Amino acid sequence: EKNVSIVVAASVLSSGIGINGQLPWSISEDLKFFSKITNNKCDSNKKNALIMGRKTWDSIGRRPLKNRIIVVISSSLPQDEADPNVVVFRNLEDSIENLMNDDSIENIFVCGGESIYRDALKDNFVDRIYLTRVALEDIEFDTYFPEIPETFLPVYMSQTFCTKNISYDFMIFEKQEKKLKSIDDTVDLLGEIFGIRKMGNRHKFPKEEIYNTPSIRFGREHYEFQYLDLLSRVLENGAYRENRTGISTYSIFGQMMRFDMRESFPLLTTKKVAIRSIFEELIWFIKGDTNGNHLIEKKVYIWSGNGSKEYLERIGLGHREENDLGPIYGFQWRHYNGEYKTMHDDYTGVGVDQLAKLIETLKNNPKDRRHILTAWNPSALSQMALPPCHVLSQYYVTNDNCLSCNLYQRSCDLGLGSPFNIASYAILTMMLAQVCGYEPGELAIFIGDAHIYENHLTQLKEQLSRTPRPFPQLKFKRKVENIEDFKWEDIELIGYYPYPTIKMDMAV
Amino acid sequence: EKNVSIVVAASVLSSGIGINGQLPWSISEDLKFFSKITNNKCDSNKKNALIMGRKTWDSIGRRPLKNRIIVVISSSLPQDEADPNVVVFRNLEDSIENLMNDDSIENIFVCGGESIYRDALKDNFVDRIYLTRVALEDIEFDTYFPEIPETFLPVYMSQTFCTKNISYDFMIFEKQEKKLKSIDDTVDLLGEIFGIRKMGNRHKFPKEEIYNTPSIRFGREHYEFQYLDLLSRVLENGAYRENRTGISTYSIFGQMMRFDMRESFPLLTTKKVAIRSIFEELIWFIKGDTNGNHLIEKKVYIWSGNGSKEYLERIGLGHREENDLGPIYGFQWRHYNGEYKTMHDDYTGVGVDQLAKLIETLKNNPKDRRHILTAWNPSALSQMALPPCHVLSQYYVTNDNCLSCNLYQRSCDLGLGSPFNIASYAILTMMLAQVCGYEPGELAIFIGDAHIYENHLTQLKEQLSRTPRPFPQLKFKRKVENIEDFKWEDIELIGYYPYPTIKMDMAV
Ligand SMILES: NC(=O)C1=CN([C@@H]2O[C@H](COP(=O)(O)OP(=O)(O)OC[C@H]3O[C@@H](n4cnc5c(N)ncnc54)[C@H](OP(=O)(O)O)[C@@H]3O)[C@@H](O)[C@H]2O)C=CC1
Ligand SMILES: NC(=O)C1=CN([C@@H]2O[C@H](COP(=O)(O)OP(=O)(O)OC[C@H]3O[C@@H](n4cnc5c(N)ncnc54)[C@H](OP(=O)(O)O)[C@@H]3O)[C@@H](O)[C@H]2O)C=CC1
Ligand SMILES: CN(Cc1cnc2nc(N)nc(N)c2n1)c1ccc(C(=O)N[C@@H](CCC(=O)O)C(=O)O)cc1
Ligand SMILES: CN(Cc1cnc2nc(N)nc(N)c2n1)c1ccc(C(=O)N[C@@H](CCC(=O)O)C(=O)O)cc1
Ligand SMILES: Nc1nc(O)c2c(Cc3ccc(C(=O)N[C@@H](CCC(=O)O)C(=O)O)cc3)c[nH]c2n1
Ligand SMILES: Nc1nc(O)c2c(Cc3ccc(C(=O)N[C@@H](CCC(=O)O)C(=O)O)cc3)c[nH]c2n1
Ligand SMILES: O=c1[nH]c(=O)n([C@H]2C[C@H](O)[C@@H](COP(=O)(O)O)O2)cc1F
Ligand SMILES: O=c1[nH]c(=O)n([C@H]2C[C@H](O)[C@@H](COP(=O)(O)O)O2)cc1F
Numbered sequence A, B: 001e002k003n004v005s006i007v008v009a010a011s012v013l014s015s016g017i018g019i020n021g022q023l024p025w026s027i028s029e030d031l032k033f034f035s036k037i038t039n040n041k042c043d044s045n046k047k048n049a050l051i052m053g054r055k056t057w058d059s060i061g062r063r064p065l066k067n068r069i070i071v072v073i074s075s076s077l078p079q080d081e082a083d084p085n086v087v088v089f090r091n092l093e094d095s096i097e098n099l100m101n102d103d104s105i106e107n108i109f110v111c112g113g114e115s116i117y118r119d120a121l122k123d124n125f126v127d128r129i130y131l132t133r134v135a136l137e138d139i140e141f142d143t144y145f146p147e148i149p150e151t152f153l154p155v156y157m158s159q160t161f162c163t164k165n166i167s168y169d170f171m172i173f174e175k176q177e178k179k180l181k182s183i184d185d186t187v188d189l190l191g192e193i194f195g196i197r198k199m200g201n202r203h204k205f206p207k208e209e210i211y212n213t214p215s216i217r218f219g220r221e222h223y224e225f226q227y228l229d230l231l232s233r234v235l236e237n238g239a240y241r242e243n244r245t246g247i248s249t250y251s252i253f254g255q256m257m258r259f260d261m262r263e264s265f266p267l268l269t270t271k272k273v274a275i276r277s278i279f280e281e282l283i284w285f286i287k288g289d290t291n292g293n294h295l296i297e298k299k300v301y302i303w304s305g306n307g308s309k310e311y312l313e314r315i316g317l318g319h320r321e322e323n324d325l326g327p328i329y330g331f332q333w334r335h336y337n338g339e340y341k342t343m344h345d346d347y348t349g350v351g352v353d354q355l356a357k358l359i360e361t362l363k364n365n366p367k368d369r370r371h372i373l374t375a376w377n378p379s380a381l382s383q384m385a386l387p388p389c390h391v392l393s394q395y396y397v398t399n400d401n402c403l404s405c406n407l408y409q410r411s412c413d414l415g416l417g418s419p420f421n422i423a424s425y426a427i428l429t430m431m432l433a434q435v436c437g438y439e440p441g442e443l444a445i446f447i448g449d450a451h452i453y454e455n456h457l458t459q460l461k462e463q464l465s466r467t468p469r470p471f472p473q474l475k476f477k478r479k480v481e482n483i484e485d486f487k488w489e490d491i492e493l494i495g496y497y498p499y500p501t502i503k504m505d506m507a508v
Helices: A028-038 A054-059 A093-100 A114-122 A181-193 A225-237 A275-286 A293-297 A309-314 A354-364 A417-436 A454-463 B028-038 B054-059 B093-100 B114-122 B181-193 B225-237 B275-286 B293-297 B309-314 B354-364 B417-435 B454-463
Strands: A004-011 A016-018 A047-053 A068-073 A086-089 A105-112 A128-134 A152-157 A161-163 A166-168 A171-175 A239-241 A249-260 A372-374 A390-397 A402-413 A439-453 A473-476 A491-494 B004-011 B016-018 B047-053 B068-073 B086-089 B105-112 B128-134 B152-157 B161-163 B166-168 B171-175 B239-241 B249-260 B372-374 B390-397 B402-413 B439-453 B473-476 B491-494
Touching: A004 A028, A004 A114, A028 A105, A028 A128, A028 A161, A028 B181, A047 A054, A047 A114, A054 A068, A068 A093, A086 A093, A093 A105, A105 A114, A128 A166, A152 B181, A171 B181, A181 B028, A181 B152, A181 B171, A225 A249, A225 A417, A225 A439, A225 A454, A249 A417, A249 B249, A249 B402, A249 B439, A275 A293, A275 A417, A275 A491, A354 A372, A354 A390, A354 A417, A372 B390, A390 A417, A390 B372, A390 B390, A390 B402, A390 B439, A402 A417, A402 B249, A402 B390, A402 B402, A402 B439, A417 A439, A417 A473, A439 A454, A439 B249, A439 B390, A439 B402, B004 B028, B004 B114, B028 B105, B028 B128, B028 B161, B047 B054, B047 B114, B054 B068, B068 B093, B086 B093, B093 B105, B105 B114, B128 B166, B225 B249, B225 B417, B225 B439, B225 B454, B249 B417, B275 B293, B275 B417, B275 B491, B354 B372, B354 B390, B354 B417, B390 B417, B402 B417, B417 B439, B417 B473, B439 B454
Parallel strands: A004 A105, A004 A128, A047 A068, A047 A105, A068 A086, A402 A439, B004 B105, B004 B128, B047 B068, B047 B105, B068 B086, B402 B439
Antiparallel strands: A004 A016, A128 A171, A152 A171, A161 A166, A239 A249, A249 A439, A372 A390, A390 A402, A473 A491, B004 B016, B128 B171, B152 B171, B161 B166, B239 B249, B249 B439, B372 B390, B390 B402, B473 B491
């Protein structure tokens, strides 16, 4: 009795594994993954058996795999005693003789093909499943991977990787039925004795109900989990709290999220995010534009709520024009401590330009620790339609010439603002990277107040029910001379296949 | 063959467990810990045996413990068949008969006393050790806990707790000799295939050599580990990088540290920290004082390096007086965007006072998400003797009326600056708490550039060789009317017993 694992690479949605007697994709890293995962052995005197259909055996060019014994399933092909590394069986179950005898075989893998995969699961010979999810969909498939039976649960999901602008993950499913103790007990007892006094009780591990894809425990690599687990922690430890809006939240303090921009783009796949709305807001910041109408003309309404007439009169800004938001983001970027009159005035030449000095500092003095962009001005706070949420950002040039970004955010809406903030500063870093001639680095976001508005509860619990899909890719179609020259047409979003969009009302 | 555990509470240094036939301390939580840890049983039909010396049996008033069978070791006391919950044995080894027979006993605990503890370890009957470390030292002990044999390694260290201004921990030692696999292998293989491309390879788990107290793996509760593990991560993944100083560092990006100020004070015990130097710098900030000499007069030299004549002339500030540092920390706190002349001028009335508006906002509108203190001013940056390291801080009022603090730090010296910054903002939060009538909350520090200067390598590796001791306590001797009225004499540091101070030269 030894282990039998399925190794397969299928499309993310339709699970297509092949077209016209070959692979729909060419990914070098995945073949090397197949090579290393099937060559994995504890005993040096043993080999691993690889079961595959005849057509699959044809697809590899009918040649043996090194240090492995290929088992071909065919009712046609002769059983050949010539090649010692290749053997043919008449049916799948008889090829499972590798269990009962032949102790020279340590582990068994099913390399499959649809016909083999389907009745390998159907007859339940499969202990484990190695799935490589690929982001190619709109192409054509004549061959698919059978839907994984409910007996399996994922124990692992890797980070998103990029090869030839194609995103892919690595997942491990296991067949689960059944089910040091000293430390677990002692901590629990201390938690009983001490109340909220013990800090371990102030941050509680989320209950399985609100924990996204609970079956994956030690195996969460994917950085969308960085957001989804923060979502869960707020649903668990969140204190019910009133705020300036009539809509109360559930708030916790001192949280963070890490993101990899090297091999992927941190855009949430559990909800369809409006990327155009995000970009057009970012280039709005970069241009230094405080005019709220310029966003609305482009059909981005996110700032309409804080850009109304009724809201401005309520905060004492009633003198102001309808959508004029005051010295907000991008004003403080391009002009710092500039005296603000209206949105129509020409502010060129006034105030400190941080974004300019930022870019200038990045390429001229990369190892400088002082690259910083701050939106928080105590003097201009009263003039703003709303104080900076993402307050300050620091940028870092790695020795391999990647550009990494840290962002502190004083107040964070996990339903609306956060999905935007994650992607927005991810784009900005990529923009700052191209202008300074760098590759994208890592994105880290630090959140002071992490909250969920009570009207988003039904929606965010829905979003948590969705198992994440690999991050998309974002490439620029041209290299601009100045960072202000970026246009929406220049952005190519590759392999984004999210879950249906979730509607959530903004608290004004 | 069942489990035998030692349960003991000893002083942190001299390991004294008792004085004059009783305990040197009275701690309610610890007795409840003893109660719950010795009442822990899997089977409801079984009881736990507690072995203790005669004098210890005297100390509890010679009365049985509920739901437990007390085993008293004496050569004098009669063996009494009267009380079924108490039994007397002539020697320790014969009392270990609980193993060979009497299956009504599930687990065995040694409640001890010095005479029992010493030859319980000496004859090696002890599988596990439950140690409660107490911060009382300078008092008198007639009874001690024997030095733990090298056969034991700690698997757990709890957070520091406070009872009657006394700090204490909870540790678990186990006797260790000997010594899912699928996930561990798959991740390793992906790490082989992909290079630094895989983000998991960019952040590597520290090698055992540079990992502080390696035996404690899943059991690190203590928040000094938050600093010590960050120390290790930099020693592992740190990129060698040049900077403005002639001394190069090893730098990583995007790190954080959490701290509990409720039950303890986050002051490093692995190195003796100068707390007076820290405080006098903080009250220096609070007063808004930019004069570097005022620190030197109080014999705090930390700013002397950046406060010299040669350093100022080097950065183009040569016009300035010797120790005048410009619009640095506390200037920007008390006066924001104030035009800076010299350190001697009277700045009262000019600039925005953040610290004032901060305190005013905290008690008037606690649930406000806008409490923020920023030292980073793009306009005044060129005038400063050095730009802000701890850039911005946000403060949070919990529903139970505790005050929690978040701090973003753009550049962090782990050898010198960080031990100061951790304690300094811990004090400031406690000060802001008293003025606004709150209890201390949690402290979270976010670090952009976490580095170790190459001259601190020998020192910081030494510091890593020291197993942490419970955090001290910090109490104020009086309640001030204004936050500026704090004096050094007002501070009482309770139960601080660090390792010897480690000298490290500041890079100028
Ligand atoms: N993305 C991935 O990981 C993988 C993709 N693929 C792709 O999928 C395609 C091939 O898959 P697919 O179309 O399903 O063909 P198969 O790879 O499953 O090959 C099937 C062959 O196996 C034999 N066979 C199957 N079932 C039985 C049975 N019950 N008894 C006896 N013999 C049996 C038959 O051979 P015979 O008729 O001669 O008796 C049959 O033609 C290829 O394009 C390949 O590249 C393949 C493997 C992995
Ligand atoms: N901090 C903590 O967790 C604990 C502290 N303590 C403290 O320790 C102090 C007392 O401990 P300690 O001084 O060590 O005294 P003990 O508690 O160890 O009691 C010793 C007695 O046990 C009997 N005994 C010991 N060894 C033998 C033997 N080899 N054969 C037969 N009988 C033996 C003797 O009694 P006899 O006269 O009959 O021969 C001896 O006097 C107290 O202050 C107590 O409160 C105690 C337990 C826990
Ligand atoms: C057609 N086919 C089946 C195939 C293709 N992709 C897969 N991808 C995955 N994730 N899992 C599979 N089971 C899988 N199977 C192939 C094709 C080539 C090789 C192959 O060349 N393997 C080499 C590896 C080549 C290299 O290192 O790039 C080896 O040594 O194992 C294997 C299977
Ligand atoms: C003198 N003595 C020995 C003693 C004292 N402190 C210790 N502290 C520790 N951490 N470990 C020990 N083994 C220990 N032993 C005592 C004194 C009182 C009780 C006691 O009252 N136990 C009650 C608990 C009391 C309560 O719940 O507050 C119980 O039900 O177990 C036990 C041992
Ligand atoms: N209470 C509150 N929450 C916020 O998130 C904000 C913002 C930032 C912001 C960010 C995103 C949106 C938003 O409309 N998100 C959407 C829709 C996006 C779209 O269609 O444009 C969603 O994902 O459901 C709206 C506002 C600006 N002002 C805000 N005030
Ligand atoms: N490169 C660099 N690193 C720094 O940490 C600083 C600081 C802040 C700072 C923080 C701590 C010290 C310091 O000397 N600390 C000491 C000595 C304390 C004392 O005896 O007063 C220590 O505990 O080891 C000196 C300066 C100010 N300027 C700095 N420049
Ligand atoms: O990028 C943003 N992200 C975000 O989450 N908000 C939300 C956070 C908060 O719910 C609201 C305003 O916070 P506050 O009322 O504390 O000023 O705006 C606003 C942004 F601009
Ligand atoms: O509180 C402080 N903490 C700290 O770590 N530094 C260090 C960080 C850095 O090593 C040095 C100067 O930062 P930089 O040269 O990058 O501007 O001062 C200074 C402080 F005042």
